[PDB]
PDB file of N, CA and C and ligand atoms in Angstrom:
ATOM      1  N   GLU A  10       0.859  -1.207   0.000  1.00 27.64           N
ATOM      2  CA  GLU A  10       0.000   0.000   0.000  1.00 27.64           C
ATOM      3  C   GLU A  10       0.883   1.241   0.000  1.00 27.64           C
ATOM      4  N   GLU A  11       0.791   2.027  -1.065  1.00 27.65           N
ATOM      5  CA  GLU A  11       1.451   3.319  -1.134  1.00 27.65           C
ATOM      6  C   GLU A  11       0.560   4.389  -0.521  1.00 27.65           C
ATOM      7  N   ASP A  12       1.188   5.474  -0.106  1.00 26.12           N
ATOM      8  CA  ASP A  12       0.510   6.544   0.601  1.00 26.12           C
ATOM      9  C   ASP A  12       0.438   7.732  -0.346  1.00 26.12           C
ATOM     10  N   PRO A  13      -0.751   8.109  -0.804  1.00 26.21           N
ATOM     11  CA  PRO A  13      -0.835   9.214  -1.768  1.00 26.21           C
ATOM     12  C   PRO A  13      -0.354  10.550  -1.209  1.00 26.21           C
ATOM     13  N   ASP A  14      -0.453  10.770   0.095  1.00 25.72           N
ATOM     14  CA  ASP A  14       0.011  12.020   0.672  1.00 25.72           C
ATOM     15  C   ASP A  14       1.530  12.087   0.682  1.00 25.72           C
ATOM     16  N   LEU A  15       2.191  10.956   0.899  1.00 25.09           N
ATOM     17  CA  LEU A  15       3.650  10.907   0.820  1.00 25.09           C
ATOM     18  C   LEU A  15       4.098  11.257  -0.588  1.00 25.09           C
ATOM     19  N   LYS A  16       3.507  10.617  -1.587  1.00 22.18           N
ATOM     20  CA  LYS A  16       3.887  10.850  -2.970  1.00 22.18           C
ATOM     21  C   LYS A  16       3.580  12.290  -3.362  1.00 22.18           C
ATOM     22  N   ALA A  17       2.446  12.824  -2.934  1.00 21.00           N
ATOM     23  CA  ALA A  17       2.069  14.180  -3.306  1.00 21.00           C
ATOM     24  C   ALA A  17       3.046  15.192  -2.713  1.00 21.00           C
ATOM     25  N   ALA A  18       3.490  14.962  -1.480  1.00 21.38           N
ATOM     26  CA  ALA A  18       4.417  15.861  -0.818  1.00 21.38           C
ATOM     27  C   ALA A  18       5.770  15.845  -1.522  1.00 21.38           C
ATOM     28  N   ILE A  19       6.208  14.669  -1.948  1.00 23.90           N
ATOM     29  CA  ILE A  19       7.477  14.565  -2.658  1.00 23.90           C
ATOM     30  C   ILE A  19       7.380  15.198  -4.052  1.00 23.90           C
ATOM     31  N   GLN A  20       6.281  14.939  -4.759  1.00 24.40           N
ATOM     32  CA  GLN A  20       6.059  15.547  -6.066  1.00 24.40           C
ATOM     33  C   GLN A  20       6.090  17.066  -5.948  1.00 24.40           C
ATOM     34  N   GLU A  21       5.442  17.595  -4.913  1.00 22.72           N
ATOM     35  CA  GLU A  21       5.444  19.026  -4.670  1.00 22.72           C
ATOM     36  C   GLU A  21       6.870  19.520  -4.426  1.00 22.72           C
ATOM     37  N   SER A  22       7.625  18.772  -3.623  1.00 22.34           N
ATOM     38  CA  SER A  22       9.026  19.080  -3.361  1.00 22.34           C
ATOM     39  C   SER A  22       9.822  19.215  -4.663  1.00 22.34           C
ATOM     40  N   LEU A  23       9.572  18.318  -5.622  1.00 23.86           N
ATOM     41  CA  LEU A  23      10.249  18.309  -6.917  1.00 23.86           C
ATOM     42  C   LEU A  23       9.902  19.542  -7.739  1.00 23.86           C
ATOM     43  N   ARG A  24       8.632  19.920  -7.767  1.00 26.12           N
ATOM     44  CA  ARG A  24       8.198  21.105  -8.491  1.00 26.12           C
ATOM     45  C   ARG A  24       8.845  22.330  -7.872  1.00 26.12           C
ATOM     46  N   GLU A  25       8.884  22.356  -6.547  1.00 29.17           N
ATOM     47  CA  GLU A  25       9.502  23.454  -5.817  1.00 29.17           C
ATOM     48  C   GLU A  25      11.001  23.594  -6.109  1.00 29.17           C
ATOM     49  N   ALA A  26      11.701  22.471  -6.210  1.00 31.18           N
ATOM     50  CA  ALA A  26      13.127  22.489  -6.476  1.00 31.18           C
ATOM     51  C   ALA A  26      13.379  23.027  -7.870  1.00 31.18           C
ATOM     52  N   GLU A  27      12.449  22.751  -8.778  1.00 27.92           N
ATOM     53  CA  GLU A  27      12.549  23.218 -10.158  1.00 27.92           C
ATOM     54  C   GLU A  27      12.360  24.723 -10.292  1.00 27.92           C
ATOM     55  N   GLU A  28      11.792  25.378  -9.275  1.00 24.67           N
ATOM     56  CA  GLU A  28      11.667  26.846  -9.256  1.00 24.67           C
ATOM     57  C   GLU A  28      12.957  27.599  -9.073  1.00 24.67           C
ATOM     58  N   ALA A  29      13.961  26.959  -8.484  1.00 25.89           N
ATOM     59  CA  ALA A  29      15.229  27.628  -8.238  1.00 25.89           C
ATOM     60  C   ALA A  29      15.906  27.952  -9.560  1.00 25.89           C
TER      61      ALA A  29
HETATM   62 ZN1  LIG B   3       2.101  -1.500  -1.253  1.00 22.44          ZN
HETATM   63 ZN1  LIG B   4      -1.275  12.858   5.355  1.00 22.87          ZN
HETATM   64 ZN1  LIG B   5      -4.028  13.852   3.367  1.00 23.99          ZN
END
């Protein structure tokens, strides 16, 4: 069982890193 909130938080982290 994967956790959609974990994945969503990491995906958000990736988008955020791409802003730099
Ligand atoms: Zn699983
Ligand atoms: Zn949660
Ligand atoms: Zn949640």
